[model samples]
Each structure stands twice: as C-alpha cells, then as structure tokens.
Target chain A: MRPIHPGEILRDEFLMEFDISPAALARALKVSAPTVNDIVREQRGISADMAIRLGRYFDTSAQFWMNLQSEYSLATAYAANGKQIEHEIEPL
Target chain B: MRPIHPGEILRDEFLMEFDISPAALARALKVSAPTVNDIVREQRGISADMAIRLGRYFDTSAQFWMNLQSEYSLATAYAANGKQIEHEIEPLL
Candidate 1:
C-alpha cells in the first residue's frame, strides 16, 4: 500500500487528537506558525531539525517522523518517476 | 543493537560482495567517482537521487538505501547528542 503523507498524519492524527491549533503547536514547539501550518497543509517536507522538535514534543524518536516523510517521498517519487527509470535501467 | 554506518554496508557488504570498485560502480550508476568513493568511505550520506540509482543497480527499493542512511544518522545522533534532549524535555507531559 502507498504510504500516507506525513502532513496528513500531523494534522489529522496529532493535531486533532491533541486538540491543538497549528499556531499553538508552533508556539509550544518554539517554531514559526507557518512551519507547522505548512506541514499540516502538506506544503512542506519535514527537516531533521523539525523532526527533532516533533520527536521531543511527542516523546517519539526523530526516526518516527523522518520515516514517515521518507516513505511518503519514496512513494510519491515512484509514482511520478519510477516508470522512466524502469524503462532506462535494468535491475540486477 | 546500534545500527551500523551505511558506508560500511555499501562497502563491505555490497561492493565487496559484488567485487565492484567504487569507480566502476559510479560509472555504472552514472554518478561521479568521488560520490561513490565518499559513500564507501563514510564521508557522505546517500541522497534521494543516488538512492534511486542504487535501487536500480541493486534490485532493491529506493527505501532500502535511504533507510540505511537514516538509521545510521539517528543512531549516531542518539549516541552523541541524545542526552541534552533527554535532560531538557519531558516525555508526553
């Protein structure tokens, strides 16, 4: 199955479950509102620094957040570009 | 157990097992020799583009290469810097 976007998880699972607005989460995280908003809206990718913040806030390892983002990126890239590479390269 | 560095996996496991030189692998992957050498030497992290190339060459998902790098970074960071965060932050508070 295709992985869900990390932003959707942040918005639907974390934010909604915690009952925190993006602005509130941002303030608590000591990050900009737009940063949180961008993730919630699926407009931005999480960086390592942001992953650490999220990990700290959620008591999860930074790996959790990064893995979500990585899976999402790989899935997206495969959907969009995998065919080109498939045609050009032969698997070993 | 702590994750091993991705470079060691690429060098000791993949390159050595395949009997491929870094320069030859780089040529086959259409990447620069320095890029392959840097990865084999543990001086560089694999980027998404390179991961795709590696996946193609190795018949694995791009996720495989990326996850190796990610795990290595996470493990290294936890060993070196996990303490400061541990002391500063409360979990689920």
Candidate 2:
C-alpha cells in the first residue's frame, strides 16, 4: 500500500512521446537494462531514488510518482481481493 | 521508472477483505508499523520484498506489483510536464 498509484497508460504515452526505448531509459535511470525493461513492462516496482531521478529528468513532482505507486498498490489489492465485482453487481 | 505502481485502493480493499490492520500488516511484512501505515495509505513506495509478500498473501503475481510501480513513475513524469490536458481538449467529447 502506498499514498499514490502508478499509471501504466501514462507510462506508455510518455515513453512514446519521448521516443525512449527501454535501453535508453535504463541508461537514463542508471539502472540495468533488464531492470529498466522490467519497470517499463510492468515487471518491477518503482523506487524512491528512481522517482527522484524521473522527477529530475521528466520535470515531474516526486510526490506524483509516490501517489501513483500508492494507487497501483491499491488497484492490485482490489483485483486480488475480488471485491470490486461486488460493486459491479450492486443494483442501482 | 518501475514496472508496477502500488495501488492504494487495492491495498485498502485487500486489508478490508483480510481484516488486516496496519499493525498486522507491519508485523506480517516485518516492517515498522508506521511504515506499513505509510504504505497502506500510500505515503511510501512499495518495496520488492513487500510486493513478494503481498503476492504470497494475496495469491497474486509479484510481477503485478512491479507492473504498477513502473506505471506510477511514468504518470508522475507526465503530470509535471503539463502535456496531458491538451489531449483532453482535443478528444471529441
């Protein structure tokens, strides 16, 4: 659980905008190539340092990344718990 | 950026389903109680070990947690640059 969640759609969109390949991201982030791939592909979690680095490179608030991280945790938790379906079934 | 972002909504939903208090989660994850609170409340980022534990406890994929982490990093970068609203205006709503 975190304060914010990550946005996959946004990640893909931004990457597309900047024409950043996974390898380029890895170099930019100073992380391993596979690690960058994992992160870009939804196989890894973001770290505080990474958030800071991203903020610097992309000119975004570090808090924003933290928020997305939290949100993602919550969404994954929801899918795992299988309770969201209840809302889907609720009658108006 | 990470592959996955932590989802607060999901964490709360899972905690509710398991009746897990912050203290309980902290104990389960062997982390500081406040740290657990921060995580559950989205004050902190999710660690790899935390993701693994969540996967084990919740029967989800660890890769799932990683996936969200990446997405969060990406979104945060977007918000700072102020390039999204233009798309909103351009869309045929």
Candidate 3:
C-alpha cells in the first residue's frame, strides 16, 4: 500500500480539520504562506525545522512529521529504483 | 536506541566485508569515490543514486541503506534543533 503524503494529512487533519487557512497557519507558525500552501498542496516536504515548529504548534512530535516525509521518500525511491537495484545486486 | 549509519555498513558489510578498498570499490561500483569515502568515514549521507549503486554492488536493498541514513538524519535533526524550535513556538490557544 502507498504511504499517505504528509501534505494530504496536513490538508485534511491540520488545515481542514482545524479550520485554519494557509494564511492563518503561516501567521500562527511564522512561516511563509506560499511554503505552507505548497506543503498542504503536496508540493513540499516538511523540513525538520518546520516539523519541530509544527509539533510545538499542534503538539505532535516532530518525528511524526519527519517519519511521514521519510517514509514517503523511501517508498518513492523504491518505486522508482527497486527493480533495477534488485536486478543489479547479488544479495550478499 | 540509535540507528546505524549506512556508511558504517558500507565499511563493514560491503567494503571490508568484501575485502575491498574504497578506491577499488569505486572502480567496481563505477561511481565517484570521494563522496563514497565521506560516507564510509561517516562524514556524509547516502543519496538515492549512491544507494542504488551500493545496493547493486552489495546485493542489499537500497532501503536498507536509505533507512540507515534516514534515521541518522532524523536523530541528528532533532538533537540539533528540537529544543530551539520547541522553545520558539507557542501552542495554539
């Protein structure tokens, strides 16, 4: 199964659920609105700094956000490169 | 518990495990050795390209390598900035 994008969660769980606009979130978190909107629109990955800010804001640990981004990256990497890597390696 | 560095595995499992030097590893793996050296020395993280090359050379999955790097990064980030970020941000009221 595909891992959910952190943006998807932010769009649903954070922004929508909290009834906060991106502008509102940026104002609250002291981040750029464009970046916040990009993140919510699945265009940006959460950085560690943002994760910490978010965890502090929403009170979820930074790991929760980073794990989502990392997992998404891993799964994306595998999807793109797995077969070729598997084909090339010897499995030692 | 701390996650292991991918470079650590590259040294012990891939290079040393195969009795290959870093230069020889580059020769065989067909990539830049400078970054590979950094990785083995724990001075750098593995990228997807290197992970693919390494997994192919080692017969291990790239995820194994990426996971190591990822956890190291995750821990490193939190350790370096968690307190500062936490101190700066106030929760929503």
Provide DockQ values for all models, in the order shown. 0.48, 0.05, 0.43
True-vs-predicted CA distance for residue A70, candidate 1, Å: 1.2
Q: Tens digits of per-residue lDDT for model 3 on A1-92?
A: 28677999888878888888888888777788997888888888887677777777998876778777766776677768667655654544
TM per candidate:
0.83, 0.43, 0.75
DockQ of 1: 0.48
Question: Number of backbone collisions per candidate, in order?
Answer: 0, 49, 1
The C-alpha stretches of model 3 lying farther than 4 A from their native spots are: A1-3, B1-20, B24-30, B49-64
Per-residue CA lDDT of model 2 for B1-93, tens digit only, reads: 433336564565677877878887666655678876877666676555566555655667665765566566556555554243222222112
Residue A31 in candidate 2, Cα distance off native in Å: 1.6
Q: Which consecutive 10 residues in model 2 chain B have the weakest lDDT in total?
A: B84-93
Question: Candidate 2 at A9: error in angstroms?
Answer: 4.0
By lDDT, the better pick of 1 and 3 is: 1
* Candidate 2 wrong stretches, greater than 4 Å: A1-7, A82-92, B1-93
Give the true-structure RMSD of model 1. 2.4
lDDT tens per residue, model 1, B45-90: 8877778888998988788988897787777766575666456555
* Model 3 per-residue lDDT tens digits across residues B1-93: 375677887887767767888787766666667867888888888876677677677767666776677677766776587676666667976
Clashing pairs in 1: none
